[PDB]
Amino acid sequence: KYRVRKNVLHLTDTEKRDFVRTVLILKEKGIYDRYIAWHGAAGKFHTPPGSDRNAAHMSSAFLPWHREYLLRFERDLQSINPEVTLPYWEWETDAQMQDPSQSQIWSADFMGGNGNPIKDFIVDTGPFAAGRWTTIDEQGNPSGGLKRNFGATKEAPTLPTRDDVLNALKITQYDTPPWDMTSQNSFRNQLEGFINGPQLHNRVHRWVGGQMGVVPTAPNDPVFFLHHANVDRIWAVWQIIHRNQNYQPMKNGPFGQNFRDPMYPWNTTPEDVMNHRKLGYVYDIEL
Amino acid sequence: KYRVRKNVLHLTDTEKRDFVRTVLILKEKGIYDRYIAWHGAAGKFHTPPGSDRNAAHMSSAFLPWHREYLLRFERDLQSINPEVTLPYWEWETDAQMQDPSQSQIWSADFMGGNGNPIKDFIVDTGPFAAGRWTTIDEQGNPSGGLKRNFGATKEAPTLPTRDDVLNALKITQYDTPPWDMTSQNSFRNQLEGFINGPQLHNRVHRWVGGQMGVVPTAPNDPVFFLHHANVDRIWAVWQIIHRNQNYQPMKNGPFGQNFRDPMYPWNTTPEDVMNHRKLGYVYDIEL
Numbered sequence: 001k002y003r004v005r006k007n008v009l010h011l012t013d014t015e016k017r018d019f020v021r022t023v024l025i026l027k028e029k030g031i032y033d034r035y036i037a038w039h040g041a042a043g044k045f046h047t048p049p050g051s052d053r054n055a056a057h058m059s060s061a062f063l064p065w066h067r068e069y070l071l072r073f074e075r076d077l078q079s080i081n082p083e084v085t086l087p088y089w090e091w092e093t094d095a096q097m098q099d100p101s102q103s104q105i106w107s108a109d110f111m112g113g114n115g116n117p118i119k120d121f122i123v124d125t126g127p128f129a130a131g132r133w134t135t136i137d138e139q140g141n142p143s144g145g146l147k148r149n150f151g152a153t154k155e156a157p158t159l160p161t162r163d164d165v166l167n168a169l170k171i172t173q174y175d176t177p178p179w180d181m182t183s184q185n186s187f188r189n190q191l192e193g194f195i196n197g198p199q200l201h202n203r204v205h206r207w208v209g210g211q212m213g214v215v216p217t218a219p220n221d222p223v224f225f226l227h228h229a230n231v232d233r234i235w236a237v238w239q240i241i242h243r244n245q246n247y248q249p250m251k252n253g254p255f256g257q258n259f260r261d262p263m264y265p266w267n268t269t270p271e272d273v274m275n276h277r278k279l280g281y282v283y284d285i286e287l
Numbered sequence: 288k289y290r291v292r293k294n295v296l297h298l299t300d301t302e303k304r305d306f307v308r309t310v311l312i313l314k315e316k317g318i319y320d321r322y323i324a325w326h327g328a329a330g331k332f333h334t335p336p337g338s339d340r341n342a343a344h345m346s347s348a349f350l351p352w353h354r355e356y357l358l359r360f361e362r363d364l365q366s367i368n369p370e371v372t373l374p375y376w377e378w379e380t381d382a383q384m385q386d387p388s389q390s391q392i393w394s395a396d397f398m399g400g401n402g403n404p405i406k407d408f409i410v411d412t413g414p415f416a417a418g419r420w421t422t423i424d425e426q427g428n429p430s431g432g433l434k435r436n437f438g439a440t441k442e443a444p445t446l447p448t449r450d451d452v453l454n455a456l457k458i459t460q461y462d463t464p465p466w467d468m469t470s471q472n473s474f475r476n477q478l479e480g481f482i483n484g485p486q487l488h489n490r491v492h493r494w495v496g497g498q499m500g501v502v503p504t505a506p507n508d509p510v511f512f513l514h515h516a517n518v519d520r521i522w523a524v525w526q527i528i529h530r531n532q533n534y535q536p537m538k539n540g541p542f543g544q545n546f547r548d549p550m551y552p553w554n555t556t557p558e559d560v561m562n563h564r565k566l567g568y569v570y571d572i573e574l
């Protein structure tokens with residue numbers, strides 16, 4: 001509750017400079033690659049084997065998994081600089097624009113801009129451009145740099161709207177059986193974006209394009225953490241609103257999806273991260 | 288120093304039966320799959336990206352990684368049954384036999400025998416035969432059944448001998464630059480088996496064949512843990528003989544390979560597992 005997580009647009013020049021630097025330091029030390037691998041490993045860990053659910057996606061563990069994912073990442077950031085916290089990308093407001101690519105987040109001093117159509121949509125601006133930022137493929141091998149391609153998809157030509165977020169907050173149940181892609185009246189599945197998908201979370205990924213468009217390689221783009229910090233923020237809001245609601249399933253769900261099951265690749269359970277304030281951080285809007 | 292890890296041949300019928308049962312329970316609960324996944328994930332985590340080294344193999348972290356791997360596995364076993372400890376397969380003694388496939392470890396009450404050449408070398412004996420034991424492929428997706436094919440390879444027609452083990456114990460340096468499969472005068476690289484390979488560890492894998500012949504799917508066969516318990520024992524013996532020696536490199540090696548680097552996919556460092564007795568276990572021969 002002492003660490004404040006701010007909106008990217010509400011950041012100071014010095015703050016944006018310290019975050020980027022810290023990320024570059026984590027990358028240089030080899031720590032950043034662990035998060036790309038963790039995410040890719042979880043996406044291939046099905047619960048149970050044979051089903052389309054995995055440890056991190058298309059299931060109830062989606063939200064607590066990524067919350068633990070961000071928590072570990074933020075702790076690594078502060079090991080370098082204790083004053084640095086993980087910002088979030090409030091994409092629902094950027095959607096109000098006719099061209100979200102003009103947002104301050106895509107400036108050369110933070111995340112960098114859109115991909116270059118002359119270089120197969122390779123990002124050539126910002127601190128994460130090809131030449132300063134190395135990317136790895138689905139196999140853990142070097143891939144030749146970051147790619148982006150804003151709204152060039154038919155399924156996701158736009159970013160999710162504030163109404164879309166608000167409509168998701170209307171849901172009462174955290175999740176519903178069979179705890180997967182087809183869960184109805186489920187806040188989790190709604191926020192993830194499979195209900196008339198791609199929506200919300202899934203839509204943001206498809207909108208950015210490049211590595212962000214594919215599960216095993218999405219964390220290659222630093223904006224991935226800013227995006228999921230917003231998803232985590234939206235979840236935290238839901239938990240505040242429906243304070244009487246709790247996680248599901250509590251039991252009788254697939255192993256790795258229940259309230260007290262370890263989340264691969266970790267031993268962390270959804271219960272351990274159910275209360276974000278207990279984790280030692282808070283979002284600016286809560287103040 | 289209280290948990291004793293015994294030789295498979297020195298196990299009682301009741302012991303061999305309780306170990307198998309505990310493994311089957313871990314499989315049913317979905318915990319076993321986490322170890323297959325952990326092992327596969329580490330094999331694709333290169334240190335650094337681009338090199339042929341990975342977090343668990345072909346590098347200095349090879350021995351401490353698998354020790355942590357076995358340690359975690361053993362603790363999960365005891366969560367089910369506190370009387371169960373991880374046995375080890377003294378294959379160097381089985382090599383003295385005139386038919387290693389007739390060893391008691393391959394009996395129907397423990398691991399089961401060789402595969403069936405009429406069923407594509409599927410294993411049809413023991414508690415881990417097709418129909419009672421499900422396996423997954425390199426992608427984390429379900430496969431047919433456990434397979435074995437003893438010494439049908441030209442590179443590894445035999446099991447490694449005591450002479451090979453002793454010769455490996457003669458090495459003074461734990462590891463040498465460039466810390467990989469080509470490292471010379473290295474105990475790690477020697478025990479792993481890249482020196483005039485396949486030898487020792489690598490040879491055992493290729494000798495067993497089937498899933499054990501391929502790294503990402505090797506843990507599908509329960510004998511994987513018995514095999515690596517012997518490897519951990521040999522290392523423990525080496526550490527006992529060479530008590531003044533330590534891990535290498537201490538620093539300036541690839542990230543994930545140094546003495547105090549976290550070993551993907553965990554936060555555990557080689558130092559955390561450098562002393563097997565401090566971990567709370569001991570091998571029977573140390574008594």
Ligand SMILES: O=C(c1ccc([N+](=O)[O-])cc1[N+](=O)[O-])N1CCN(Cc2ccc(F)cc2)CC1
Pocket residue numbers: 057066194197198201202203205206212213214215216218219228
């Ligand atoms: O575009 C989609 C989408 C849309 C529809 C379906 N579907 O119906 O199967 C499946 C997917 N998908 O890729 O999972 N997505 C965008 C990419 N994204 C990858 C991703 C998601 C969450 C992360 F933290 C990291 C990466 C995952 C979801």
Ligand SMILES: [Cu+2]
Pocket residue numbers: 039056057066
């Ligand atoms: Cu994800």
Ligand SMILES: [Cu+2]
Pocket residue numbers: 201205218228
């Ligand atoms: Cu995502």
Ligand SMILES: [Cu+2]
Pocket residue numbers: 326343344353
């Ligand atoms: Cu291994």
Ligand SMILES: [Cu+2]
Pocket residue numbers: 488492505515
């Ligand atoms: Cu091995």
